[PDB]
Design a protein around this nucleic acid. Structure first.
Ligand SMILES: [Mg+2]
Ligand SMILES: [Mg+2]
Ligand SMILES: [Mg+2]
Ligand SMILES: [Mg+2]
Ligand SMILES: [Mg+2]
Ligand SMILES: [Mg+2]
Ligand SMILES: [Mg+2]
Ligand SMILES: [Zn+2]
Lengths: 66, 101, 197, 55
RNA sequence: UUAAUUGGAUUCAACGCCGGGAACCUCACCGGGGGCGACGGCAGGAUGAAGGCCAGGCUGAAGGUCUUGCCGGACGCGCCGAGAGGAGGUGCAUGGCCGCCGUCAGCUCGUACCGUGAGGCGUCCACUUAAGUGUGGUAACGAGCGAGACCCGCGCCCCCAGUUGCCAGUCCCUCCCGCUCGGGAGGGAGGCACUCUGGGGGGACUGCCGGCGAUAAGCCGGAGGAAGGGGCGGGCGACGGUAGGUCAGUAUGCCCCGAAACCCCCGGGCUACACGCGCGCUACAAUGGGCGGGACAAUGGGUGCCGACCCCGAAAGGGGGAGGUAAUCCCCUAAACCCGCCCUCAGUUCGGAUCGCGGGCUGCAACUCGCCCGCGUGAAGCUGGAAUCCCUAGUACCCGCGCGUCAUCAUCGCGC
């Protein structure tokens, strides 16, 4: 049951609507871009944040935003 | 020469690396060779016990554990350094022992 | 070997501490620490009333040293007292303060709100008290008071929070007090921010 | 001698040879690596002796 | 049943449980013997109180008493109150701890609204999740603790390290075989290549394709990958309830004991046996029993202790005794497995209970009641009625090992 957590959305939506051009669609590109824009010190947290932002951008750019 | 041998051993891991790097640097600043800190196997003491005072209820246990990290350093003997490693002022939860061969 | 060294010099402190708790019951004995140097040791005791612990111009510390060296180890001791680091962020002082207030005769609700207001004033994130004894009856009870964020399970609620326990003997019976304070710098994993441009 | 009828005997083995260093009971006493405590006192003093529970 | 066979626990959640493998002690139980009143006052006291002994009776044994007479130098249970001490009562007077509902998904708060009120709404509906975990609609809009996150191990790669760990490629010497062209075994010189030990980083995110579902939450299948859909196994148990267990681990209020129910010492009991029950160990044989050879482990422990090596003994064991305060020395060449020979379907070369005699170890003491060895005797048992238990992968089953308890004794607990 890989449900995305509660506090991951509430920050991915905040930094995907603040730097809307520093985020491409590549996974390993965002994965590096995330560590330095925040103060996260975990390792499995930046991975899920990166995944969610990638989903977000590729779901938005192609049109309807849900 | 006579290749002093120093043996540090402590339960907090961080507070060991700092005295290790002190020794490394002191050696480096002066003229002497050295064999870097050789990690020796951890010795973990383990104590299994029951949990309840009386004898009623199911049987559930505890696993207490205490780990002791060790190291080993080989170094030559120069009084300029043999002395320089005396004002090193180890912490209180560390043990040091010096001996030559 | 070497483990027999490490866990022989960890017990002495336990015994010294467990005895001084009783002895300096009042003046709020806060805790100690042994510094083992050549030619002798050196003990430090962070009391809450240097006056009472010292004595009448030094007529108690003599007994403390003789007792601490004859019944215990510590072949060359040297005691000296100090003042508490942060008395409002140390649970095991508030517990004894509230226990004393109770056994002096105050009602158990004024004490708890006094204590919580003082603590949350001096700058804690959250506190929780819990009293349970024979108060106002002959069947025991239990009550609870709390103020804010306070973690209870996991790893973070084992090292960050500060907890302490005490007793309070009375004319009816005993009463247990159990406090738990969170230092003003919690930093749970969920508190992720954005270092901005 | 009235000091020969309340005085014990010096045992050196058997359950009556050792007692807890803090409580004072005979019986279930821990002798691993030297410390000599009950099974009940070691459980509520351990996290100050340095130990931790990992699993 | 007994002088005593001390107590607590009775469905799940009492019965190899109280770490409970009790020779003395542990000990709380039956028989016997002897000691103990800080402190205030009373009979008395330097014409010498309290208080102590060579020898001998009583006694299981004892200057414990008495016989005998020596000593010591101030106080006094022969009297009153009090006070130590209590494994004595009460878990239905309490604290602390722990089992179970339950690692289940619950339990509340601020303000607003609905009811005269107890109360309600949020916390409801629809789909989805291991989950009050989510996505939509809604007199509700937001929050807190629990869940998830967090901590420790396992599997793959890279860097830094090379002794007390490892020895592949070079270099000498010694020794063996088809007599040597070839192959093999030890040393010692050198090196951290490989394994290993352990600090720091990398790696996996429903990320990438196809199909469901709305196009959202999410769910199926396929790649590439050491690993895939909480990566696998653990730690951490919310507000409350259970008059659940523990006063016999410590702490503790009230009531009884107080020259005793307090403190010591010797001998007995908890080990008694027409009987009902719980959990296990060995078998009822060939999917085997015996005899001789051949193979390969990991966790852990040692100074009151672990014992290599040599020598006596048929075996248990005995007399010496290096090296070890530890990656160095020791415990420590595991068993199920394989090859060769005997047995041939039988209460047997299956099964080894029960008993006789002889030799040893620990101990202050082995009869009641310790453990170990050699020869002999050889009980029930031929697959189990109605019923009932545990297990989803390196898991169940089968075989051995190490710690704990411990002066000796493991059919047990916890790990490999
Ligand atoms: Mg007995
Ligand atoms: Mg419930
Ligand atoms: Mg109860
Ligand atoms: Mg009851
Ligand atoms: Mg019994
Ligand atoms: Mg046979
Ligand atoms: Mg016997
Ligand atoms: Zn104890």
């Amino acid at each position: 049951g890989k449900i995305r957590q509660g506090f991951i959305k509430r920050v991915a939506r905040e930094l995907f609507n603040k730097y809307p051009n520093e985020f491409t669609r590549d996974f390993e590109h965002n994965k590096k871009k995330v560590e330095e824009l925040t103060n996260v010190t975990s390792k499995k947290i930046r991975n899920r944040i990166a995944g969610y932002i990638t989903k977000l951008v590729r779901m938005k750019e192609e049109g309807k935003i849900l | 020469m006579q290749k002093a041998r120093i043996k540090l051993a402590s339960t907090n891991v961080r507070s060991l690396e700092e005295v290790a790097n002190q020794i490394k640097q002191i050696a480096e600043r002066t003229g002497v060779r050295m064999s870097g800190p050789i990690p020796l196997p951890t010795k973990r003491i383990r104590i299994v016990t029951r949990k309840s005072p009386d004898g009623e209820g199911s049987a559930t246990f505890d696993r207490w554990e205490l780990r002791i990290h060790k190291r080993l350093i080989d170094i030559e003997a120069d009084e300029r350094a043999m002395r320089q490693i005396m004002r090193i002022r180890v912490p209180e939860d560390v043990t040091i022992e010096i001996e030559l061969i | 070997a070497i483990e027999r060294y490490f866990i022989r010099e960890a017990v002495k402190e336990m015994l010294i501490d467990e005895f001084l708790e009783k002895e300096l019951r009042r003046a709020g004995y806060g805790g100690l620490d042994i510094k083992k140097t050549p030619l002798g040791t050196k003990v430090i005791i962070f009391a809450a009333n240097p006056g009472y612990v010292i004595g009448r111009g030094g007529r108690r510390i003599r007994e403390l040293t003789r007792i601490l060296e004859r019944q215990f180890g510590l072949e060359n001791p040297q005691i000296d007292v100090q003042e508490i680091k942060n008395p409002y962020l140390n649970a095991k002082v508030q517990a004894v303060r509230i226990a004393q207030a109770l056994e002096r005769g105050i009602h158990f609700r004024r004490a708890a709100y006094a204590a919580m207001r003082a603590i949350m004033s001096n700058g804690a994130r959250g506190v929780e008290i819990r009293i349970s004894g024979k108060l106002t009856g002959e069947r025991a009870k239990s009550v609870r008071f709390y103020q804010g964020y306070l973690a209870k399970v996991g790893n973070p609620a084992e090292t960050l929070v500060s907890k302490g326990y005490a007793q309070a003997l009375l004319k009816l019976g005993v009463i247990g007090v159990k406090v738990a304070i969170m230092p003003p710098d919690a930093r749970l994993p969920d508190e992720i921010e954005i270092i901005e441009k | 001698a009235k000091a020969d009828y309340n005085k014990r005997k010096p045992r050196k083995f058997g359950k009556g040879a050792r007692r807890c260093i803090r409580c004072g009971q005979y019986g279930p006493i821990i002798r691993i690596h030297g410390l000599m405590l009950c099974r009940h006192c070691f459980r509520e003093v351990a996290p100050k002796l340095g130990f931790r529970k990992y699993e």
